[PDB]
Amino acid sequence: VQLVESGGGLVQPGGSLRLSCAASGFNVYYSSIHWVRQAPGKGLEWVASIYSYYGSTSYADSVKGRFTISADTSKNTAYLQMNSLRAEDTAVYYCAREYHSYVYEPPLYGMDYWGQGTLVTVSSASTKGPSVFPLAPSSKSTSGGTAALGCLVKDYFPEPVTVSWNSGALTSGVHTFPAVLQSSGLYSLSSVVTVPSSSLGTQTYICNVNHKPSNTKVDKKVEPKSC
Amino acid sequence: QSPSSLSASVGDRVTITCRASQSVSSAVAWYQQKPGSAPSLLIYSASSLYSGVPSRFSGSRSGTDFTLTISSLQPEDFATYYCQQSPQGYLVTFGQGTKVEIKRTVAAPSVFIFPPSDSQLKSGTASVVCLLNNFYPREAKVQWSVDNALQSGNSQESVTEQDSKDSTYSLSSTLTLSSADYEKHKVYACEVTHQGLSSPVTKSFNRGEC
Amino acid sequence: KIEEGKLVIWINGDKGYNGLAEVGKKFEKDTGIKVTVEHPDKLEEKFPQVAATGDGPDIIFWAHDRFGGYAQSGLLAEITPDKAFQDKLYPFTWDAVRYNGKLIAYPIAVEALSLIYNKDLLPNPPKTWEEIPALDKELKAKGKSALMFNLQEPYFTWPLIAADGGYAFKYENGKYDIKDVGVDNAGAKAGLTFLVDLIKNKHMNADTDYSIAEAAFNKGETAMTINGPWAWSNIDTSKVNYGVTVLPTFKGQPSKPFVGVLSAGINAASPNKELAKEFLENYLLTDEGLEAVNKDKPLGAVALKSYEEELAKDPRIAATMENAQKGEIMPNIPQMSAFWYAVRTAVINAASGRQTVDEALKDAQT
């Protein structure tokens, strides 16, 4: 029993996107198929539902008139046609199944099966790889103590980027922060790691920033100051 | 909406009250969601335990109030929990999330400040980063000072999730300026206030020094 | 891969499966055939998955409408009750278990909406819909209300709409005519008009759904509601002195609720079809067998005439069977999806006042 989603990606405000929710192990005709979305760092928001057996479709107020939910019974697949998209529609979109026993029942059983989710980003920005700038450790580091260094990953679109250190050899003490959407429409984040102060001159620290959407991979060496 | 926070220890009893369910008296479902994964159904019709859910999860209704109780918190229970209602039968609303986080001893942050790199400056922008590393609890205040002028509105912060090992947080505070504005000032400082610090800690540098 | 020489039975967990297990005990004691009753979660969704590969139970109990798709897929064997056995059940219950001129299941129980009323607020419930506006006026002066029921779903609103001539699909000789729909006729217009007039005259709220109506009646805030036997347990806890009676008439004609028939089908892949027939006909569908299930969890009204006459001493059960006989078997054809959309759309458009009753009905078809 599975719900497989597809059709997400990038789109501009005012544009259109069509999501698919292919089911197996049950017949969507006799269930309510829901779309639930989740903005980055935010909670769940119900979007729409379809209950073909009972000839009903429903929409949240925030999307009514712009989205259209439908289903293809022969393909055991539901669809969400999203039109007139806005930046606020950016979220991970899930599809989910609500079970029903009898035609007279009110909603009772909740959502037992959920798809894996697909990311929809609505933006005027074009796909662009990041610039990587070094966060260089302090020359006044704790003598015989802990030093911090990192990489600033600036001005990319869209999410996500992955950051590793020394090609995965350095993992302890690494913190990669969640990206923030800057007012320019591009994302930024930093990845830091703490190391013993005595290793600053000997061990090499390179951050491996990979941005698959742009086919960009930058390996930036991080070394102390120039004086 | 950003989810609420609740700090607890393994073995604690936790009771979450659904805030969105004050609308109507319909059936209430509860969900658990972990970072990067789809939510999972815990309870439906206020009190019916979903097949396979451990029996330490229970849900109850007392009038217009619907609650979810974890009788004794297990390590795998630290996650975000949502309640779901159906106000008019066709409409569906999820409540604000409640994230159950791991309690630990107060840890003061170690603070680091990073000047902008030469490469970024040559592109016309200056980002200054203040790092607060491995602290608990999450609550902390960062105050930027530029030649002792208090700043507000030109910095953004980002917090990690609780570290898998030590259960602490880390926070970056990034102050963004144009190259021209950055070069007009000398002293750059971030002042950190936190429960673990008996007095605020300030890290600073002078622009263009060593 | 179904074991031969024994019976595996599937029935929903909300039914008296322990009572049914006692009938299987009697069957095993008399015939030596072991009977295993199971209530698997969502059995009506698991059945088409396992039966398609020759697996599954020998017998499956579920609502009749789902069996239409099973027979469509060839998952249900044709049953062979003789004339004498069919005479022991009400003739209309066999209409619910017929697919393309073939009997494919045994009728077990009968459910339908009834008029539920508060005996204290209303010792004599109204016989007609036309009385309800005047009754609401007398109750609204006491801070109460006359009637609250789920207006949001067409299953609950159709009985009134169909009363004067509305129908889903013209039913002939066990065959539905998908071309002859009766949603946009003079009978349906008069029923929806009276429903909308109840809302415009402030006797009912257009936002009342299943949960609101159930809460109001169980707290004594309204004198009547419309619901089925599944809702009685919530009222028993409320301790409201309630009664169950025939639905009000409209223009002198009965309300016509849809009829749901709990049915027992025989797996087409089962090698124990004759044993299954013997168990269902000679042990379960008897006064003794249905009583064992009923004692565990009540079945409501039943299709077996002799045991229904006994159960009908409960006036709530007699009303259920009465409304069912005045109603119609819910069609088990896929075209019901379009029917539900039309009725739900016409009610919401007319009740909110956006469209007239005539506009609401014709726009629900197009």
Q: Would you call the peptide bond into A158 cis, given omega within 30 degrees of 0 as the criterion? A: yes
Q: Which of B191, C149, C155 is nearest to A105 (CA)?
A: C155
Q: Is the C-alpha dihedral spanning C16, C22, C26, C28 positive or negative?
A: positive
**What is the rounded CA–CA span in Å between residue B12 and residue B6?**
12
* Annotated domain spans of chain A: 1-124, 125-227
- Domain containing C33 — which CATH number? 3.40.190.10
Contact C260 A30 (CB under 8 A): no
Q: Does residue C232 share a domain with residue C291?
A: no
The minimum CA-CA distance between C8 and chain A, rounded to whole Å, is: 22
B1-104: which CATH number, 3.30.300.30, 3.30.360.10, 2.60.40.10, 3.20.20.70? 2.60.40.10
Q: Does residue C223 share a domain with residue C283?
A: no
Contact A177 B27 (CB under 8 A): no
Q: Does residue C235 share a domain with residue C189?
A: yes
Q: Does residue C73 share a domain with residue C18?
A: yes
The minimum CA-CA distance between A71 and chain C, rounded to whole Å, is: 13
Model resolution, angstroms: 2.2
Q: If 0-12 CB within 10 Å is exposed, 13-18 middle and 19+ buried, where does residue B179 land?
A: middle
Q: Does domain A125-227 have CATH number 2.60.40.10?
A: yes
CB B104 within 8 A of CB B168: yes
**What is the rounded CA–CA span in Å between residue B115 and residue C132?**
79
Pairing of strands C222-227, C145-147: parallel
Q: Which residue type occupies C220? A: G
Q: How many domains does one find in chain C? A: 2
DSSP letter at C81 equals -
Q: Does residue C352 share a domain with residue C287?
A: no
**What is the rounded CA–CA span in Å between residue B207 and residue B184?**
9
Name the token pair of C351.
């009740």
DSSP letter at A136 equals P
Task: Count helices and strands (H / E) in chain C.
Answer: 15, 15
Name the token pair of C107.
């009728």
Q: Which domain holds residue C319?
A: 5-111+260-331
Dihedral (Cα; B21, B25, B26, B28), 10-degree rounding: 40
Q: Does residue C199 share a domain with residue C287?
A: no
Q: Does residue C268 share a domain with residue C246?
A: no
Count of CB atoms within 10 A of residue B30's CB?
Answer: 28
DSSP letter at A214 equals G
Q: What share of chain C is helix, strand, coil (3-state, %, to 5)?
A: 45, 20, 35
Q: Which residue type occupies A157? A: F
Helices (H), C52-117: 64-72, 83-86
* Annotated domain spans of chain B: 1-104, 105-210
CB C199 within 8 A of CB C152: no
**What is the rounded CA–CA span in Å between residue C84 and residue B133?**
85
Cβ of residue C209 closer than 8 Å to a chain A Cβ: yes
| A162-165, strands of its sheet edge to edge | A162-165, A205-211, A216-222
Classified as helix, coil or strand, C304 is strand
**Phi-psi category of C38—alpha, beta or left, where left has phi over 0 and alpha has psi -120 to 50?**
beta
CB A73 within 8 A of CB A28: yes
Q: Does residue C304 share a domain with residue C249?
A: no
State the structure-solving technique.
X-ray
Chain C stretch 284-323, residues whose beta carbon is closer than 8 A to a beta carbon of chain A: none
Contact B156 A42 (CB under 8 A): no
Count of CB atoms within 10 A of residue A15's CB?
Answer: 12
**What is the rounded CA–CA span in Å between residue B4 and residue B100?**
9
**What is the rounded CA–CA span in Å between residue C205 and residue C210?**
12
B210: closest chain A residue by CA? A227
Q: Is the C-alpha dihedral spanning B42, B46, B49, B51 positive or negative?
A: negative
Q: If 0-12 CB within 10 Å is exposed, 13-18 middle and 19+ buried, where does residue B69 land?
A: middle
**What is the rounded CA–CA span in Å between residue C364 and residue C289?**
46
| Discontinuities in chain C (C→N > 2.5 Å), after residue | none
**Beta bridge mates, B83:** B30
Count of CB atoms within 10 A of residue C78's CB?
Answer: 13
Residues in chain A within 8 Å Cβ distance of B114:
135-136, 150
Burial A116-126 (b: 16+ CB within 10 A, else e): ebbbbbbbebe
Angstrom CA distances, C123 to C200, C224, C245, C247, stand at 27, 11, 12, 15
Phi then psi for residue C224, to 5 deg, are: -140, 155
Q: Does residue C251 share a domain with residue C139?
A: yes
CA atoms within a 13 Å half-sphere pointing along the CA-CB vector of A212: 5
Q: Which of B50, B57, B52 is nearest to B71 (CA)?
A: B57
Residues in chain A within 8 Å Cβ distance of C339:
55
Q: Does residue C85 share a domain with residue C57?
A: yes
Q: Does residue C132 share a domain with residue C39?
A: no
Count of CB atoms within 10 A of residue A162's CB?
Answer: 13
Second CATH level (architecture) for the domain B105-210 = Sandwich (2.60)
Residue position matching structure tokens 């203040």:
B130
